[PDB]
């Protein structure tokens, strides 16, 4: 019965071609609910889920202000990074940040995050205890030292344990019809000859939420991984997800193979076989 | 609810 809220922000410099592009998005579990894009006409936080549309103008104004406050800070952090790494104005650089919180089924705080990457590499991260930092290099060690002295971890823990949880709990209630309701996978198996003597069996899971799912193949009731393929879980575009798993088998031996599906929305795991 | 990040590197 646990839930997460996550914000994902990306700043990409383009010196001389205007201010850096800043994009932020916010998720509750696997559902996107807001975006901000510095290149959009509005220059405002915008809704990306039906249930956030309830929020009044005070919400949109204040969230807009906060996200812009972050974008200004991170533009400056891009400058600082250039100095610490001794990089020119010619390059496009990327500063990414993720923060958010995890709550248990009764709303109790489980975990917080507050972390940064520069050009695709870890820069600095708030540790599990929310009292200390991991720096990835000499540059980030300078940042770590400042933030330790300035007791920045304390302010971030205050946000993570407070506002972050408070917000998440409110969105969960307001969005309960879709946020708190599991969608079980609809399943089926397909069969494709590849020669006179081999076939591909494909086990499908469709229309499920949340994204977490496990598909496994067995042969004669024994786990089978040889000759199997698994695609990455993918968005359908309507709020649900898709995945499949496949195995190449000797034609005539299809019946020995079973696909097993585990998902939160299933009261019991599913076992599938090809049934033409 | 967003975190109004103020802190520089």
């Amino acid at each position: 019965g646990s839930h997460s809220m996550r914000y994902f922000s990306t700043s990409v410099s383009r010196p001389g071609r205007g201010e850096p592009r800043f994009i932020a998005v916010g998720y509750v579990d696997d559902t996107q609910f807001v975006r901000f894009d510095s290149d959009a006409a509005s220059q405002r936080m915008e809704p990306r889920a039906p249930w956030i549309e309830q929020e009044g103008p005070e919400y949109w104004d204040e969230e807009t202000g906060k996200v812009k406050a972050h974008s200004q800070t991170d533009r400056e952090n891009l400058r600082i990074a250039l100095r610490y790494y001794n990089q020119s104005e010619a390059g496009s650089h990327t500063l990414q940040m993720m923060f958010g919180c995890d709550v248990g089924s009764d709303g109790r705080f489980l975990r917080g995050y507050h972390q940064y990457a520069y050009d695709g590499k870890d820069y600095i991260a708030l540790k599990e205890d929310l009292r200390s930092w991991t720096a990835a290099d000499m540059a980030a060690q300078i940042t770590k030292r400042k933030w330790e002295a300035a007791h920045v971890a304390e302010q971030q823990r205050a946000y993570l344990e407070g506002t972050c949880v408070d917000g998440l709990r409110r969105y969960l209630e307001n969005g309960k019809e879709t946020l708190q309701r599991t969608d079980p996978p609809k399943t089926h198996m397909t069969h494709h000859p590849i020669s006179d003597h081999e076939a591909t069996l494909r086990c499908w899971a469709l229309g499920f939420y949340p994204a977490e799912i496990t598909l496994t193949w067995q042969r004669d009731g024994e786990d089978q991984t040889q000759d199997t393929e698994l695609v990455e879980t993918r968005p359908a575009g309507d709020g649900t997800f898709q995945k499949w798993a496949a195995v190449v088998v000797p034609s005539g031996e299809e019946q020995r193979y079973t696909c097993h599906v585990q998902h939160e929305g299933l009261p019991k795991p599913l076992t599938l076989r090809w049934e033409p | 609810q967003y975190n109004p990040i103020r802190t520089t590197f």
Partner: single-chain antibody, 227 residues
Framework: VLTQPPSVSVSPGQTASITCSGD??????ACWYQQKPGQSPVLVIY???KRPSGIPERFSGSNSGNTATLTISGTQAMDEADYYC????????????FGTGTKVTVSSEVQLLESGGGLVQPGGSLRLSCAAS????????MSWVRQAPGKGLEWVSA????????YYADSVKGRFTISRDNSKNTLYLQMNSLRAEDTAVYYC????????????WGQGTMVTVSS
Amino acid sequence: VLTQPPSVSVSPGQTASITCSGDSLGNKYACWYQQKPGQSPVLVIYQDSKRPSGIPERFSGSNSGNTATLTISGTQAMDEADYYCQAWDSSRGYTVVFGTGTKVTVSSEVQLLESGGGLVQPGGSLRLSCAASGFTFDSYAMSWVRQAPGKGLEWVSAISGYGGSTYYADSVKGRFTISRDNSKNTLYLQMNSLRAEDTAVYYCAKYTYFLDAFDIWGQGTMVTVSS
């Protein structure tokens, strides 16, 4: 942290320039607040150069390098007041900072209502309240900002919209506790182990991230630690 000249003297009609310097101004907006004696602070400039509705055009602002400047052109007798710059300390997570203030002498439905102030013995306790009206209370972070007699504004404490996050100045940490009853549209400040240095008018101030300023101020409640 935010340095301002002690005073500026002008004659009616001439331009008055008030400066404020600090590293954070480089990557943060400057606000300016006017305060006439007997009256509470008023926002005159936000986001470096923007005036709130109702503020006269003769007040302007800029913020370049690490300096912010409030200019009053054609300064009038009614402009005699103390002016405070305000930004955020970018070295810190959540720390509002007011400039030292400048005394400018000229010579030839929204509502916050504070209460609870009064005389208290040294090492005593007191609880302050503020009732809010005319805006969606739980949509805004609320602060207490104090002013000792004849001194500047000092931000004391802040609380998030739904109350889960609270923030304190180093000066009051461990001794004061901010909280809110959103159903009562009321903010509180529990003050323990009071000292001489706590003697001040305590203002309730509403912050808006949209403007990045305290746009609404109450009338204050006076706390005197004596005897």
